[PDB]
Amino acid sequence: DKICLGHHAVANGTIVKTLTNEQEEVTNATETVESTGINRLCMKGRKHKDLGNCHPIGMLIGTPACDLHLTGMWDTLIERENAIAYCYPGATVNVEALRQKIMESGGINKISTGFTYGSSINSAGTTRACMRNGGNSFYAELKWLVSKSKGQNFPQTTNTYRNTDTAEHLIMWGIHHPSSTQEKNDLYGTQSLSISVGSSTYRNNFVPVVGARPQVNGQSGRIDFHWTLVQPGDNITFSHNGGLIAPSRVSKLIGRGLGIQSDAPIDNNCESKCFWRGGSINTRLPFQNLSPRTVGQCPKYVNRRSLMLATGMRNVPE
Amino acid sequence: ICLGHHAVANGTIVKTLTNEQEEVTNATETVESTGINRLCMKGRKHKDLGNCHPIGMLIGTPACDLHLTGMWDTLIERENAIAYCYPGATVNVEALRQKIMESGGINKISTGFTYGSSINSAGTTRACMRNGGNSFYAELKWLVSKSKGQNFPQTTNTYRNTDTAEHLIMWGIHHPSSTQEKNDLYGTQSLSISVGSSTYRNNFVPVVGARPQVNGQSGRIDFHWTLVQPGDNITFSHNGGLIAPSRVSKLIGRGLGIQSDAPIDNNCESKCFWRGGSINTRLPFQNLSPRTVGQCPKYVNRRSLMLATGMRNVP
Amino acid sequence: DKICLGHHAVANGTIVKTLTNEQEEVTNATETVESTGINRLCMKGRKHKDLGNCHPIGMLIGTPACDLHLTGMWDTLIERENAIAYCYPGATVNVEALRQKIMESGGINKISTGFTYGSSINSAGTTRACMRNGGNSFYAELKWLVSKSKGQNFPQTTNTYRNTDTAEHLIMWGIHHPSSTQEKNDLYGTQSLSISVGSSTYRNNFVPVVGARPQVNGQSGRIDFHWTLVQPGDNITFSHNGGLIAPSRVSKLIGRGLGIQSDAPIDNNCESKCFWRGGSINTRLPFQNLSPRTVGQCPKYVNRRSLMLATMRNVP
Amino acid sequence: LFGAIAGFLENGWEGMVDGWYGFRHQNAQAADYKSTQAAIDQITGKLNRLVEKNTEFESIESEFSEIEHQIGNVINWTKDSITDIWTYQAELLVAMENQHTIDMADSEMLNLYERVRKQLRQNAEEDGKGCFEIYHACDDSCMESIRNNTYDHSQYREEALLNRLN
Amino acid sequence: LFGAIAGFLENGWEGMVDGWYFRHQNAQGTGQAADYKSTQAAIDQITGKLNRLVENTEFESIESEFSEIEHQIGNVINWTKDSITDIWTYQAELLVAMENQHTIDMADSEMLNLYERVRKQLRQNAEEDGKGCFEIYHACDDSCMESIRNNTYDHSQYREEALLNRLN
Amino acid sequence: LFGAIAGFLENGWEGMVDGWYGFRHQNAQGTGQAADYKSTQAAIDQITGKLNRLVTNTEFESIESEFSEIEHQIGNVINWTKDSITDIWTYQAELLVAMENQHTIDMADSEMLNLYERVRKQLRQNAEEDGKGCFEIYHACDDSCMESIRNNTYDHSQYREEALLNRLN
Ligand SMILES: CC(=O)N[C@@H]1[C@@H](O)[C@H](O[C@@H]2O[C@H](CO[C@]3(C(=O)O)C[C@H](O)[C@@H](NC(C)=O)[C@H]([C@H](O)[C@H](O)CO)O3)[C@H](O)[C@H](O)[C@H]2O)[C@@H](CO)O[C@H]1O
Ligand SMILES: CC(=O)N[C@H]1[C@H]([C@H](O)[C@H](O)CO)O[C@@](OC[C@H]2O[C@@H](O)[C@H](O)[C@@H](O)[C@H]2O)(C(=O)O)C[C@@H]1O
Ligand SMILES: *[C@@H]1O[C@H](CO)[C@@H](O[C@@H]2O[C@H](CO)[C@@H](O)[C@H](O)[C@H]2NC(C)=O)[C@H](O)[C@H]1NC(C)=O
Ligand SMILES: *[C@@H]1O[C@H](CO)[C@@H](O[C@@H]2O[C@H](CO)[C@@H](O)[C@H](O)[C@H]2NC(C)=O)[C@H](O)[C@H]1NC(C)=O
Ligand SMILES: *[C@@H]1O[C@H](CO)[C@@H](O)[C@H](O)[C@H]1NC(C)=O
Ligand SMILES: *[C@@H]1O[C@H](CO)[C@@H](O)[C@H](O)[C@H]1NC(C)=O
């Protein structure tokens, strides 16, 4: 005649780690690190734009690939691995800043510069390297100004964009660097070329430079892109002897949105807020070990396979 | 004989490792809040710049005449401080500004540059004004031909640092609004300004273009600066466009730099400051501002954290 | 009749730190913060490379002091305080980025550019500032090009290096800047000078400039260095009227390495994984006191001289 | 560490699936509710604290385009240090709260072994087993009277004293 | 963790002042007193915790408040500072939670300890009802209760007269 | 936290060196000192468990040149980052050490309380406790019976009668 006080035990218990003991068996535990994430991009609850093979810069300049992304609004902007920025070979100055600025946006609106040109200017210049449909073409937001009659000197020109908005506008132009000392003469004439640009907050000048270069996309020439932010009430003046690739329209970045770099397939059933290069992560758990590098509302990444949080007493039986 | 613990009618609650709602007899908070919105400059030999920008000290904009020289253990910059009376920009402006803001003092040493009689150094603008009249940067001179339209003569001026500490030398380049007002000021010459020391080599060409009027001025003056080591000399070989240095600046020691629009209370001490006011506390954590300066407590994203100073309360 | 229960104590008790009491006597305690360092560089089990007075840039351009370090294989590269990069007074654009790039390399290889020059060009220009074997010389991986006749105009010239490797290549060229007009006219002629570099992924235009400056190593001229990466199956082209310091060989940074800037001399019988400016660190402790700037797989730097850890309450 | 588990108790009962803490008895098995509830509420309290913890972050480093080398190795060093810190925070967290977990799971056993002790009072005696010895015939009603926590030591002292001293 | 405060002591007394941790009955009347040593022992530990709390390396500015900052580096700074803030926040919550758990549980301990010194002192002469009260089987004048608080109490003095009451 | 170490055991035994935890007795023959293995070993094992936890690699490269100068802005943005990391880690070190020490001391105290409890339950009725850590033994205990208690072999029942008759008179 007696009474026994005891604790319960399981058949198969799980091991955890403590202050004083490694390999401490416990009745139950739950992990605090998530090692599994969805391969797909989970975009439910988020109105988003997918760029595919369109690079963000392209939106601002009008690369054919970005035709269906010249304007738009979005919670979330997704960029892909080999997206095209340039049809005509070139580069952009401080490109990473600009690209980031675009991924930090929640939409783009475009606005005519209202630029008009002299009769001695051919403002419909095109190129084999920038194809729309089957036709020779060019960047949608830019015009390649050449002298209407081959070989004459390009006239001294002046175009001033005037901003009448309550927000700043991003403006982008280009500078042509020909391949042959002939090409130059056939486009802008033989005169010394020069392209000054200037607003209340920006001053710069661009000399075109003929040089022997390898052909990229069947072109030895090069267009280098330059961009600045034009404040409300601010005007910006272009003064050019020829060489200026000049903006037809101008870009207003609008709102705030989450930029994503990835190649994961989009999915519209799954909910998430934390994204990385392959797939997405949604988990109650505070910690994670998939990606060291992640975007948005994300669980802190730790370099461990597992961290079991014990959910009960010591496991000890017969 | 019976045993028992105390209790109170009304208890303060604390978060706990297992319980987020645990009633306790008393407690104290571990975060600071609603700190003093003012600038506590007790003991600190400070210097309020007002409308004068840091760089303005260097180039001597009129707003900064009271700040051309001096010493200080704390430098306060106000939001709408004027860097340039004459419209322009500075190359690597942030590095200069931060350099100045970690400085304990500025001393001016005259360059000694002298000019021939075909050169006019007394050039001024309405953009820069003292006594309600046209003036210029008090530490620079604007060089133009004495005979309007003529050619600026090729000129050489070498600042020689004969100190035992490095000096910071600033100069300006003038980019004219139009081809006219260029010829007028410097002539029909091709222009060039090459600067060279034992540690620095750069070339500058004044550029002509149309631009909107800032401060009623379509011209531009961009600024540049380099360090000249002890026993090192620096040479300016120029043709027209150079805004020459008449003096040169030496930063002396360190000094804490504060950015703030808040008023200076001279009768309180502090170790910590942000955009508005100062923070004074023993507490390790605060939530007034993510961006602080000085011997500050850590910033935390919580409106409150309660530390139980007492046992669990059971009424 | 008693049976009793008790614990041990000692005469000397170790004071430790707790949550509720700053100074609690305890039987025994140990340190968790290392304060002692080797004072040597432990390169055993590491293929290492002590540069001496060879700055990593010099391995690219071919500075005399770096004659022993023009090509190599290593897993650890050590730079020294007295390293030379420029025998002839000049500068390099993006110098720190490039140096860090070299310091992350696990080897360098050289490849000829195959550049040739017409008989209006002296390819073998030298200087006093770069001594090799006794006598005037110049950067082992570059050629200084001047008119063969002390007065004549340097000829318009075009040289193209084509990358036919499966790996990126790191090309370096220089751009001389004479002190005077006289000097200028003597080296390249009275004509207006211009250099231009061009590839698929790169495009630049350089122009020499005459100005008066002080003399460094008895030289008032300058040689400003510039560099770029050149992708496989691509051409890089130089078009110059003179003033171009042209590459004779290009560099290929191979692999990964650890880059250590240290005063300490090498011990090739030490094993180690954590280093700093003087010496290295071999400990089992998790924290460290020696230096806030260490490199490699090192314990973490704490701002505390001592942090003692109790190994019971010692009451006597 | 309290005495109860991995101490004077040598074993835990696999048979008990109904609760953490239980009663067994020879007579002529059950589990206590309140003790289990007390011991599980606190596992759910830091399960609750753990599951909900985050600031919005953006992509400073880029995936598809080479970044400037100096800013890139500064970003890599910063990230690597934040990762080390959070890994340490993590391991410390789980080790601390596992320690607390087990120590408590011990404490909630002993707290109500000390209930039973002080309820039986002088009507029973402490053993090496941890499984109390009753000297008087308690039916399933007496034993239920132990577990419900209403009872009367008074009603049995006169009886049990006679069994302890003869 | 420990048993007393939330386990078998079923509430706290408000009337108690200048003490964290005594009530009797006897015949003369009822008097209430608070034990000095246990409470000071707990309070000292709490003060130690606070002093540990209130015991800062200087920082310069890295963001320009009043002017442009280069986008990319500014983003780097925002990421870094928000990250550090996140870490420090987590540390703050962790410290406050564990400090609170330790505070409460340690105070509970400090009660239990007194309960056990008293039980080991009264020895045979008394009994446990399990609300932490002790049943005294031999009256006890106010001076005797005072002796219980004082720790001057000899157990063998009342042992026999008490044992007899225990048995009958 | 537990009554034993700083409470009802006022002092420790310096003379005893074999173990953290021990038995000392007086009987008609003499007085003897011995150590209880398991009680000490548990605590030693948890201590060395801690030390084992105290002692992996992540490889960092230099971001600060020491022989070349660094750009200013990035330079002290880096000074800022490194000072912040250093503050974090030093704070971590102090917190870790303090809390781990508190747990260590209260652990040893717990092990002592466990030994005391084991002995008390083992002795049962035959002995009584003064609040000094010792047990008043009211039946004469042979040294063989002394390390009968120490072994835990000890059977209370065999002496049960004698102490009882001694107890009530
Ligand atoms: C005609 C002659 O040789 N005269 C002797 C001088 O050489 C010598 O003076 C020093 O000249 C220095 C510059 O000399 C070089 C150099 O760097 O070594 C000579 C190089 O062959 C020349 N290389 C090329 C490719 O042109 C090089 C170059 O022109 C400049 O470096 C370009 O900036 O210059 C230097 O200016 C010294 O300061 C100067 O004293 C004197 C003294 O030994 O004796 C003369 O008879
Ligand atoms: C040194 C010098 O040449 N100072 C001139 C100055 C410069 O020529 C000019 O700023 C270079 O860009 O111009 C000043 O006049 C400018 C002023 O002239 C008014 O008449 C006009 O109506 C205004 O719109 C404005 O352009 C000047 O004050 O800066 C005169 C000064 O002497
Ligand atoms: C931008 O250009 C406009 C016009 O060229 C300038 O604004 C004008 O303001 C003046 C002064 O009141 C008026 O005389 C004109 O009629 C206005 N024109 C128009 C169409 O609005 C404006 O000052 C320039 N902005 C800057 C910053 O230079
Ligand atoms: C680099 O130079 C080589 C050689 O001029 C170029 O490749 C040649 O490739 C083209 C087409 O691919 C052939 O028609 C030639 O016969 C090749 N020449 C030899 C000798 O192999 C290559 O196109 C250049 N790289 C770039 C990117 O312009
Ligand atoms: C003192 O502590 C160290 C570290 O734990 C240990 O090696 C040593 O054995 C201890 N001293 C004694 C006498 O045990
Ligand atoms: C500086 O100038 C002085 C006088 O002209 C001269 O003695 C000295 O050599 C110059 N210093 C350098 C480094 O050229």
Written in H, E and C, the secondary structure of chain B is CECCCECCCCCEEECCCCCCCEEECCEEECEECCCCCCEECCCCCEEECCCECHHHHHHCCHHHHHHCCEECCEEEECCCCECCCCCCCECCHHHHHHHHHCECEEEEEECCCCCCCCEECECCEEEEEECCEEECCCCEEECEECCCCCCCCCEEEEEECCCCCCEEEEEEEEECCCCCCCCCCCCCCCCCEEEECCCCEEEECCCCCCCCCECCECCEEEEEEEEECCCCEEEEEECCCEEEECEEEEECCECEEEECCCCEECCCCCCEECCCCECCCCCCEECCCCCCEECCCEECCCCCCEEECCCECCC
- Indicate whether residue C304 lines ligand 1 (CB < 6 A): no
Q: Do D118 and E83 touch (CB under 8 A)?
A: no
Query: Is any atom of ligand 3 closer than 6 Å to the C-beta of B213?
Result: yes
Q: Assess contact for F42 and F36: CB atoms under 8 A.
A: no
Secondary structure class of A161 (helix, strand, coil) = strand
Backbone angles phi, psi at A214, to 5 degrees: -45, 145
Residue type, position C242, single letter: G
Structure tokens at C80: 């020294």
Which residues from E are below 8 Å from C20, CB to CB? 44-46, 48-49, 52, 106
* CA count, 13 A, side-chain hemisphere, C103: 26
What is the DSSP code string of E24-52?
--TTT---B---HHHHHHHHHHHHHHHHH
Q: Are strands B31-32 and B285-286 parallel, antiparallel or unpaired?
A: parallel
Distance from CA of A199 to the nearest CA of B (A): 6
Burial class for E70, CB neighbours closer than 10 Å (0-12, 13-18, 19+): middle
Distance, C-alpha A265 to centroid of its chain: 18
Method of determination is X-ray
Q: Give the minimum alpha-carbon distance from A317 to chain D in angstroms, rounded to a whole number.
A: 5
| Ligand 2 center to B84 CA (angstroms) | 16
Q: Do C224 and B201 touch (CB under 8 A)?
A: yes
Strands C203-206 and C195-198: antiparallel
What distance in angstroms lies between residue E70's CA and the mean position of ligand 3's atoms?
Answer: 30
In terms of DSSP H, where are the helices of A62-103? 95-103
Beta bridge partners of A184: none
Domain span at E21: 1-168
CB-CB neighbors (< 8 A) of A7 in chain D: 4-5, 9, 12-13, 16, 20-22, 105, 109
Chain F residues inside the 8 Å CB shell of D84: 58
Which phi-psi region, left, alpha or beta, contains residue E148 (left: φ > 0; alpha: ψ -120 to 50)?
Answer: alpha
Contact E73, B283 (CB under 8 A): no
Return residues 100-119 of A near E (CB < 8 Å): 100-101
Task: Return the residue matching tokens 């009633």.
Answer: B23
Å from CA of A162 to ligand 3 middle: 9
Q: The tokens of A225 are what? A: 């892109």
Q: Is residue C41 within 8 Å of C264, Cβ to Cβ?
A: yes
**Residue C212 is nearest to which of B192, B198, B237, comparing CB atoms?**
B237
The closest alpha carbon to F5, from F101, F129, F112, F120, belongs to F112
B6 torsion bin: left (phi>0), alpha (psi -120 to 50), beta (else):
beta
Q: What is the CATH number of the domain that holds F31?
A: 3.90.20.10
CB-nearest partner of E99 from B81, B271, B307:
B307
Tokens of D60: 């400073």
CB D69 within 8 A of CB E67: no
Task: Find how far residue E133's CA is from the centre of its chain.
Answer: 19
Expressed in angstroms and rounded, the spacing between residue C162 Cα and the centre of ligand 4 is 9
What resolution in angstroms does the PDB record give? 2.8
Exposure b/e, F40-75, CB count within 10 A at least 16 = b: bebbeebbebbeebbeeeeebbbbbbeebebeebbe
D100 vs B17, B19, B301: nearest CB: B17
**Six token digits for residue B129:** 């004004």
Report the atom number in ligand 1 closest to the C-alpha of C187.
Answer: 26
* Cβ atoms within 10 Å of B9's Cβ, excluding its own: 7
Out of F54, F68, F82, whose CB is closest to C286? Answer: F54
Cα(B88)–Cα(B105) distance, integer angstroms: 26
Distance CA D112, CA D148 (A): 12
Question: Do C205 and A216 lie within an 8 Å CB cutoff?
Answer: no
**CATH 3.90.209.20-classified regions of chain B:** 45-262
Nearest CA in chain C to E49: C20
Which tokens hold the place of F160?
A: 């049960």
Residues 6+ apart with CB under 8 A from F113: D3, F2, F3, F4
Multiple choice CATH, B1-44+263-315, 3.30.70.1140, 2.10.77.10, 2.30.110.10, 3.40.120.10: 2.10.77.10
Q: Check if CATH label 3.40.50.300 holds for domain A47-264.
A: no
What does each C-alpha distance from F169 to A105, F116, F163 come to in angstroms?
A: 93, 26, 10
CB C36 within 8 A of CB C305: no
Inter-chain touch F102–C19, beta carbons under 8 Å: yes
> Which ligand does the CA of C200 lie closest to?
4
Neighbours of chain E (3+ CB pairs under 8 A): A, B, C, D, F
Q: Does E71 contact A300 at a Cβ distance shorter than 8 Å?
A: no
Residues of C in contact with F73 (CB under 8 A): none
Taking CA–CA distances from C96, the nearest residue in chain D reads D70
Nearest-CA residue of chain A relative to B177?
A: A198
Q: Which CATH class is domain B45-262?
A: alpha beta
Distance CA A138, CA A151 (A): 21
Range list for CATH 3.90.209.20 in chain A: 47-264
| Contacting partners of chain F (3+ CB pairs under 8 A) | A, B, C, D, E
CB pairs under 8 A between A and F: 19
Give the one of A19, A22, A303 whose C-beta lies nearest to F103's C-beta.
Answer: A19
Chain B residue with minimum CA distance to F72: B95
- CB-nearest to A212 from C158, C200, C205 is C158
Mark A211-250 as b/e (b = at least 16 C-beta within 10 Å): bbbbebeebbbbbbbbbbbbbeebbbbbbbbbbbbbbbbb
* A303–F53 C-beta distance less than 8 A: no
E53 phi, psi to nearest 5 deg: -70, -40
**Rounded Cα–Cα distance for residues D146 and D150 (Å):** 7
Contact (Cβ atoms closer than 8 angstroms) between residue A280 and residue A38: yes
Burial class of A39 by CB neighbour count within 10 A (0 to 12, 13 to 18, 19+): exposed
Q: Which CATH superfamily is domain C1-46+265-316 in?
A: Hemagglutinin Chain A, Domain 2 (2.10.77.10)
Query: Does ligand 4 lie within 6 Å of residue C180's CB atom?
Result: no
DSSP state of D122: G
Q: Which of C215, C216, C217, C220 for a ligand 6 pocket mutation test, highest count of atoms within 8 Å of Cβ?
A: C215
Q: Which of E10, E82, E98 sits opposite B17 (nearest CB)?
A: E98
Identify which of F108, F99, F95 has the alpha carbon closest to the alpha carbon of residue F46.
F108
Residues from chain C contacting residue E106 (CB–CB below 8 Å): 20
State how far the Cα of D4 lies from the Cα of D20, in Å rounded to an integer: 13
Distance from CA of C192 to the nearest CA of F (A): 34
CA nearest to B68, candidates B117, B19, B130: B130
The answer to whether A213 contacts chain C (CB < 8 Å) is yes
Instruction: Give CA–CA dist B239/B194, Å, rounded.
Output: 9
Q: Please, what is the angle between helix F37-54 and helix F72-123, to 10°?
A: 170
C:36-95 residues touching chain D, CB 8 A cutoff = 94
- Give, using CA atoms, the residue closest to atom 9 of ligand 3: A233
CATH 2.10.77.10-classified regions of chain C: 1-46+265-316
Cβ neighbours of C312 in F, within 8 Å: 5, 20, 43, 104-105, 108-109, 112
A:C CB pairs within 8 Å = 34
Beta bridge partners of D134: D124
What does residue A230 show for φ and ψ, rounded to 5 degrees? -95, 115
CB-based contact E111 B308, cutoff 8 Å: no
Task: Specify whether the CB–CB gap between D125 and D133 falls below 8 A.
Answer: yes
Range list of β-strands (E), F13-152: 21-26, 31-35, 127-129, 135-137
The reply to whether A96 touches chain E by the CB within 8 Å rule is: yes
Query: Would the CB atoms of C101 and D69 count as touching at under 8 Å?
Result: yes
Alpha-carbon distance B233 to nearest alpha carbon in chain C (angstroms): 7
| Ligand 4 atom nearest to CA at C235 | 1
Rounded-to-integer distance, Cα C165 and Cα C295, Å: 33
> Ligand 4 pocket: which of A213, A215, A217, A222 to mutate (most atoms <8 Å of CB)?
A215
Range list for CATH 2.10.77.10 in chain A: 1-46+265-318
Instruction: Report the distance separating Cα A185 and Cα A241, nearest Å.
Output: 12
Ligand 5 environment, Cβ below 6 A = C 28, 30, 311
Q: Both ends of chain E: CA-CA distance in Å?
A: 38
What is the DSSP pairing of strand C244-247 with strand C48-50? unpaired
> Is D84 within 8 Å of F88 (Cβ atoms)?
no
Closest residue in A to E83 (Cα) is A300
User: Rounded to 5 degrees, what are φ and ψ at C20?
Assistant: -105, -15
Q: Do the strands B256-259 and B12-14 form a parallel or antiparallel pair, or are they unpaired?
A: unpaired
Query: From CA F83, how far away is CA C301, in angstroms rounded?
Result: 10
Query: Based on the structure, what is the number of domains in chain E?
Result: 1
Q: Do B198 and C209 touch (CB under 8 A)?
A: no
**CA-to-CA dists, residue A212 to A215, A221, C176, angstroms:** 9, 9, 21
Report the alpha-carbon distance of residue A199 to residue A205 in Å, rounded. Answer: 12
Query: Residue C160 forms beta bridges with which residues?
Result: C237
How is domain A1-46+265-318 classified at the architecture level of CATH? Answer: Ribbon (2.10)
